[PDB]
Design a protein around this ligand. Sequence first.
Ligand SMILES: [Cl-]
Ligand SMILES: [Cl-]
Ligand SMILES: [Zn+2]
Ligand SMILES: [Zn+2]
Ligand SMILES: [Zn+2]
Ligand SMILES: [Zn+2]
Ligand SMILES: [Zn+2]
Ligand SMILES: [Zn+2]
Ligand SMILES: [Zn+2]
Ligand SMILES: [Zn+2]
Length: 375
Amino acid sequence: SYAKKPHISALNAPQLDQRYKNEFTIGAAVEPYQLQNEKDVQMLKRHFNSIVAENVMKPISIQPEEGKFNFEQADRIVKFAKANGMDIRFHTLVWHSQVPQWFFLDKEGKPMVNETDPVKREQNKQLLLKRLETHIKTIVERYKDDIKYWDVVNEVVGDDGKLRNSPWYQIAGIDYIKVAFQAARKYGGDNIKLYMNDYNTEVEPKRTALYNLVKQLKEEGVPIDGIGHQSHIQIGWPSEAEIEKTINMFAALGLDNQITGLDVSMYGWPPRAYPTYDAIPKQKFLDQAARYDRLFKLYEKLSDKISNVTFWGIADNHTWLDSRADVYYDANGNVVVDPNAPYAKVEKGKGKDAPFVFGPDYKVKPAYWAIIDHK
Ligand SMILES: [Cl-]
Ligand SMILES: [Cl-]
Ligand SMILES: [Zn+2]
Ligand SMILES: [Zn+2]
Ligand SMILES: [Zn+2]
Ligand SMILES: [Zn+2]
Ligand SMILES: [Zn+2]
Ligand SMILES: [Zn+2]
Ligand SMILES: [Zn+2]
Ligand SMILES: [Zn+2]
């Protein structure tokens, strides 16, 4: 939007959540250590009214061995949110990544996916489903009074438009999704809100597969209240038109929509990253600000169908996108960022992305001014 507008400390900037408070909550994803850092604490207090765990509420973080529950890290995020009046999202009860392998071992300690006996396969399904229910039961019995929004399952639809063929699906079929939602409703009650969370929700054939799956589950009475759109997006993709079509399509089913992991990468896919923040040209930040301007104008247009927009981080000094920021080098050792250009080697995850409206020094970016205004 504007470059006249100064690069001031975000701790002196108009509050993001208050700008959007009648449209949707504004959330940030966090690690417990950020709650012991003065600037991160002040950022959350000043700008955000919703919170989610980057990592410490994922399955392997909560029950790394059967019967060993580590709630200590998740508790710290819950305590902070309650003390500051923030909504909490739980990420996530079921996922094919960051998930302990003991879930999928049969009683003899062998991988359940290798079982060929159909009678044993059925016993493995029921055992996996029992373990799934106990994991969800224990978590929801602890947090049902504190955590309003739940990513019950994450990424269960494949990018090929089929259900994702994870061990969950190989072993139990579609019932693991039904069991997860039924268990969360049973032990959590009517007041927690249950979401199916995924990325590339705008992209066919994934989008229609997600649509059909949710429609079918709600016809069968499986409790599902909304869709989580991870929204790990780029400056130019996906188009605002396709985002709008997606949000409307699920709203038509009676589903809430939440933007659960928003970041606007500086790069394409696979990314060709700059090696450092300082090397990103100023024009990239202007392009990103214009993208954020259109994006939040669209969220506001659709505000009656969106209850929350959560960024997957606080400020540019910390983003999981850095793990994807591969730096490409030509034969002379110069950085290559042109997506089709010659190159000799790549340094995977060594570069720097810049996906938020707050810079790594906790000063506001052009993208912040683009979404704090009313134009
Ligand atoms: Cl991270
Ligand atoms: Cl800066
Ligand atoms: Zn306003
Ligand atoms: Zn606030
Ligand atoms: Zn630097
Ligand atoms: Zn709303
Ligand atoms: Zn992180
Ligand atoms: Zn992630
Ligand atoms: Zn700066
Ligand atoms: Zn604007």
